[PDB]
Symmetry: C2
């Protein structure tokens, strides 16, 4: 029956579903989403950063704890797979992680968990850190690449003279220059999630080697 | 002093001060030049055209690697060099991500990195997965580091809120006895080119046993 942090966070995400651009998320907008005035949002949030911190924490809460089996490879795999599902459930999820500091217990214990799995498995403190942060990097860059390329492909398929023109120029160049490999590369889009798992298993196979 | 090169530069300068591509507008580029939007449009039909041109401008600066014919080594050279290229331009990752690779330089590089793998025996789908996964690694790697230095700056220049958050983080690690997160602290480190180089090698190491599992 009254304004709460939760009511605002939901409105923020609701706002992102409409306009999936985190930089466009302003306090006034979030206010108008609730039919209120910006000043009201500030009673619960000092600035946009405080709102982002809460949103990030909100996302973490939806993470599904993976079923661990004691195998460092599978377990870490289960973790990354579940983060892939999570980041696929909220708009700008990656940008939100990127733009905030993990100052919430939930996110911290997951990171500590993934790292321990590797440390307890015999990996160097430096190598477990590289591994875990590297896997996050792969997911971050893949999710946004996919998010931004989905839009581009949509604009092209939605009659967009310019980009369409760009796409044709691209395909002609590849052809006129017999760029075989790039040519077959276009073919794939390639099941996204499946691709991600393949990339991690590959990284994981590399750890196992040395 | 108006020309594509001048517009392009003004954009990058604009981003240097505030490396958030989402804030780049035709109206802001014009202001940066001391002109109004219409003038700019005579050079670019829209923001997307400016980005395409900016993506090209970035690729043109790609230092051609010296290859020897070995897939592991040559592919590593390409990534080391792409890592250097993305340290020279603000928002290089976001720009390549929000543009289609229709410019020559890009196509030549993508097709040739994929050529390194295909000729070495890697299946078409593993070559694609490998080449794009390495780019994904670098992209997330560079975006994460970019915000990092920005947040670090904000804290230092007196941002009390963020300073408080960094503090809370450490309090939780201690309150919940997060032993591994604590040791994780001593890593500045996982932001250096060698960390990226180590990440790429671990991936190429996996490749010597994957989709090699799917090769031949
Ligand atoms: Cl975003
Ligand atoms: Cl426009």
């Amino acid at each position: 029956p009254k304004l709460s942090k939760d009511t605002i966070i939901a409105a923020a995400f609701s706002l992102l579903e409409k306009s999936p651009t985190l930089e466009q998320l302003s306090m006034r907008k979030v206010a108008k989403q609730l039919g209120v005035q910006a000043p009201a949002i500030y009673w619960y949030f000092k600035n946009k950063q405080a709102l982002l911190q809460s949103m990030a924490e909100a996302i973490e809460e939806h993470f599904q704890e993976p079923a661990l089996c004691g195998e460092w490879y599978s377990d870490l795999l289960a973790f990354m797979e579940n983060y892939y599902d999570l980041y696929q459930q909220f708009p700008c999820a990656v940008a939100i992680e990127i733009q905030t500091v993990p100052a919430y217990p939930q996110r911290l214990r997951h990171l500590n968990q993934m790292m321990g799995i590797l440390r307890e498995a015999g990996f160097s403190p430096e190598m477990t850190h590289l591994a875990v942060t590297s896997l996050q990097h792969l997911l971050f860059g893949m999710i946004m690449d996919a998010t931004e390329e989905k839009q581009l492909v949509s604009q092209v398929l939605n009659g967009d003279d310019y980009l369409k023109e760009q796409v044709l120029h691209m395909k002609q160049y590849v052809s006129d220059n017999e760029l075989t490999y790039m040519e077959e590369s276009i073919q794939f889009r390639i099941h996204q999630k499946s691709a991600f798992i393949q990339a991690v298993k590959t990284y994981l196979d590399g750890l196992q080697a040395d």
